Design an enzyme around this catalytic site. Structure first.
Site, PDB file in Angstrom:
ATOM      1  N   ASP A  92       0.855  -1.178   0.000  1.00 28.45           N
ATOM      2  CA  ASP A  92       0.000   0.000   0.000  1.00 28.45           C
ATOM      3  C   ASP A  92       0.896   1.234   0.000  1.00 28.45           C
ATOM      4  O   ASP A  92       2.126   1.133   0.000  1.00 28.45           O
ATOM      5  CB  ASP A  92      -0.960  -0.016   1.197  1.00 28.45           C
ATOM      6  N   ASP A  95       1.241   4.829   2.324  1.00 28.73           N
ATOM      7  CA  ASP A  95       0.816   5.379   3.609  1.00 28.73           C
ATOM      8  C   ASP A  95       1.139   6.865   3.656  1.00 28.73           C
ATOM      9  O   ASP A  95       2.267   7.264   3.354  1.00 28.73           O
ATOM     10  CB  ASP A  95       1.525   4.642   4.762  1.00 28.73           C
ATOM     11  N   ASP A 131      -3.420   4.408   2.646  1.00 29.64           N
ATOM     12  CA  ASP A 131      -3.786   4.740   4.016  1.00 29.64           C
ATOM     13  C   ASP A 131      -3.559   6.234   4.216  1.00 29.64           C
ATOM     14  O   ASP A 131      -2.498   6.750   3.859  1.00 29.64           O
ATOM     15  CB  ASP A 131      -2.960   3.926   5.028  1.00 29.64           C
TER      16      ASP A 131
HETATM   17  N1  LIG Z   1      -0.269  -2.011  16.013  1.00 36.68           N
HETATM   18  C1  LIG Z   1      -0.094  -2.371  14.735  1.00 36.68           C
HETATM   19  N2  LIG Z   1       0.127  -1.434  13.811  1.00 36.68           N
HETATM   20  C2  LIG Z   1       0.283  -1.956  12.570  1.00 36.68           C
HETATM   21  C3  LIG Z   1       0.234  -3.284  12.202  1.00 36.68           C
HETATM   22  N3  LIG Z   1       0.442  -3.415  10.835  1.00 36.68           N
HETATM   23  C4  LIG Z   1       0.614  -2.187  10.411  1.00 36.68           C
HETATM   24  N4  LIG Z   1       0.521  -1.252  11.413  1.00 36.68           N
HETATM   25  C5  LIG Z   1       0.674   0.199  11.340  1.00 36.68           C
HETATM   26  C6  LIG Z   1       1.901   0.690  12.097  1.00 36.68           C
HETATM   27  C7  LIG Z   1       2.964   0.660  11.005  1.00 36.68           C
HETATM   28  O1  LIG Z   1       4.073   1.489  11.331  1.00 36.68           O
HETATM   29  C8  LIG Z   1       2.153   1.204   9.836  1.00 36.68           C
HETATM   30  C9  LIG Z   1       2.709   0.931   8.458  1.00 36.68           C
HETATM   31  O2  LIG Z   1       2.596  -0.480   8.163  1.00 36.68           O
HETATM   32  P1  LIG Z   1       1.955  -0.970   6.776  1.00 36.68           P
HETATM   33  O3  LIG Z   1       0.911  -1.996   7.056  1.00 36.68           O
HETATM   34  O4  LIG Z   1       1.585   0.205   5.937  1.00 36.68           O
HETATM   35  O5  LIG Z   1       3.225  -1.687   6.114  1.00 36.68           O
HETATM   36  P2  LIG Z   1       4.626  -1.114   5.594  1.00 36.68           P
HETATM   37  O6  LIG Z   1       4.401   0.230   4.997  1.00 36.68           O
HETATM   38  O7  LIG Z   1       5.651  -1.279   6.662  1.00 36.68           O
HETATM   39  O8  LIG Z   1       4.930  -2.155   4.420  1.00 36.68           O
HETATM   40  P3  LIG Z   1       4.038  -2.579   3.151  1.00 36.68           P
HETATM   41  O9  LIG Z   1       2.876  -1.626   3.135  1.00 36.68           O
HETATM   42  O10 LIG Z   1       3.616  -4.003   3.390  1.00 36.68           O
HETATM   43  O11 LIG Z   1       4.933  -2.428   1.952  1.00 36.68           O
HETATM   44  O12 LIG Z   1       0.866   0.566   9.973  1.00 36.68           O
HETATM   45  C10 LIG Z   1      -0.004  -4.276  13.188  1.00 36.68           C
HETATM   46  O13 LIG Z   1      -0.071  -5.503  13.036  1.00 36.68           O
HETATM   47  N5  LIG Z   1      -0.157  -3.717  14.460  1.00 36.68           N
HETATM   48 MG   LIG Z   2       2.518   0.459   3.833  1.00 39.12          MG
HETATM   49 MG   LIG Z   3      -0.618   0.885   5.485  1.00 42.52          MG
END
Ligand SMILES: Nc1nc2c(ncn2[C@H]2C[C@H](O)[C@@H](COP(=O)(O)OP(=O)(O)OP(=O)(O)O)O2)c(=O)[nH]1
Ligand SMILES: [Mg+2]
Ligand SMILES: [Mg+2]
Ligand SMILES: [Mg+2]
Ligand code: NA
Length: 328
Positions: free
Chosen positions: A192, A194, A252
């Site tokens: 996604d 963010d 997001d």
């Molecule tokens: N508490 C909590 N926050 C989460 C979780 N997954 C995501 N978040 C929140 C806090 C993270 O710093 C923020 C960004 O994570 P994302 O799901 O957008 O993934 P990210 O951008 O690290 O990688 P991706 O989108 O998979 O390429 O979303 C979770 O399992 N628990």
């Molecule tokens: Mg992300």
């Molecule tokens: Mg996200």
DNA sequence: CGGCTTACG
DNA sequence: CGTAG
DNA sequence: GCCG
């Protein structure tokens, strides 16, 4: 050090195969509801990401935090045979493959995936045949599943940010948009995009996100969002231009007042494990309660003010880590 | 043995 | 329950 | 599963 927030963790490293095997076991522990095991395997994988060179012998695991008998045996089998039988068995298991398929859907978590599994469902087409079992959110996640399973590219991000900034600028002149999440940590692809939105005059950000979403909706750019009364976070699906066509992309959007912006930036930049370990460190080692809104001293009953992420690391007695070194 | 996550939608 | 594998 |  034992906590991921105490060490730099770059995006690319020297133990990729080993960390990816431990993360398979962590993911499988989560599918079975073993939150403690999931954490340990996740932390053990993250330790290997932080090492300065490849692990080539078992002795290099000596003294490493979160390596005990089980994680060490996995590494030993990978070092000796190139494959760990436990990991391979998980990879090909019907339970792991289906839980991974189902939880990957936007709107479906472990509990929903597990119930569907126990009811005998196995494929996306099984779910589509039972639309009465689906929420509208899950219907959107199912319909857009193929596009959402295609990695978003860094090239995609810049065009998206411009269109969000355009809508944000009309909704509230002076409001800003900051790329967060994995792309802020240097990733070249993601599941996604963010964004964190604020405004330099405290309080002016109130009520902003409904105005932003309505403007993006009118542009025809929102394939799905939860409000299509007041809200400050939106997890939506965007229509993103492609060559001769368009593709669905998860986006997001989070609004924070500028007083809380350093805490929100730290929390939403991640990685998820980094932020979880930072909050655990804050509470357990420093006696302070950290979240994406602030940092609380429960003895003095006072909130720390922060003007920067650098402020927060200093408040916690941690050496500063730029986002590219938070890939825990 | 207990501990191991949050607020918001 | 979901955001959140 | 590992830590204190
Ligand atoms: N508490 C909590 N926050 C989460 C979780 N997954 C995501 N978040 C929140 C806090 C993270 O710093 C923020 C960004 O994570 P994302 O799901 O957008 O993934 P990210 O951008 O690290 O990688 P991706 O989108 O998979 O390429 O979303 C979770 O399992 N628990
Ligand atoms: Mg992300
Ligand atoms: Mg996200
Ligand atoms: Mg979950
Ligand atoms: Na999901």
């Amino acid at each position: 050090p034992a906590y991921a927030c105490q060490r730099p963790t770059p995006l690319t490293h020297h133990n990729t195969g080993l960390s990816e095997a431990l993360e398979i076991l962590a993911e499988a522990a989560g599918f079975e509801g073993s939150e403690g095991r999931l954490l340990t395997f996740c932390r053990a994988a993250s330790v290997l990401k932080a090492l300065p060179s490849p692990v080539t012998t078992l002795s290099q695991l000596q003294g490493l935090p979160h390596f005990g008998e089980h994680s060490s045996r996995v590494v030993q089998e990978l070092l000796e045979h190139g494959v760990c039988e436990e990991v391979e068995r998980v990879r090909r298991s019907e339970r792991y493959q289906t839980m991974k398929l189902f939880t990957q859907i936007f709107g479906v978590g472990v509990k929903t995936a597990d119930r569907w599994y126990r009811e005998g469902l196995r494929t996306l087409d099984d779910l589509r045949e039972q639309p009465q079992k689906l929420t509208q959110q899950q219907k959107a996640g199912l319909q857009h599943h193929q596009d959402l399973s295609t990695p978003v590219l860094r090239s995609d991000v810049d065009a998206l940010q411009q269109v969000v900034e355009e809508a944000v600028g009309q909704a509230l002149p002076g409001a800003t948009v900051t790329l967060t999440g994995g792309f802020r940590r240097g990733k070249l692809q993601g599941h996604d995009v963010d964004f964190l939105i604020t405004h330099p005059k405290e309080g002016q950000e109130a009520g902003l996100l409904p105005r932003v979403m309505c403007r993006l909706q009118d542009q025809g750019l929102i394939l799905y969002h939860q409000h299509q009364d007041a809200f400050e976070r939106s997890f939506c699906i965007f229509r993103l231009p492609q060559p001769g066509s368009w593709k669905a992309v998860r986006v997001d959007l989070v609004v924070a007042p500028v007083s809380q912006f350093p805490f929100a930036l730290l929390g939403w930049t991640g990685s998820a494990l980094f932020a979880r370990e930072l909050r655990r460190f804050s509470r357990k080692e420093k006696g302070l309660w950290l979240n994406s809104h602030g940092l609380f001293d429960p003895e003095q009953k006072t909130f720390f003010q922060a003007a920067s992420e650098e402020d927060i690391f200093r408040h916690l007695g941690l050496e500063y880590l730029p986002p590219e070194q938070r890939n825990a």
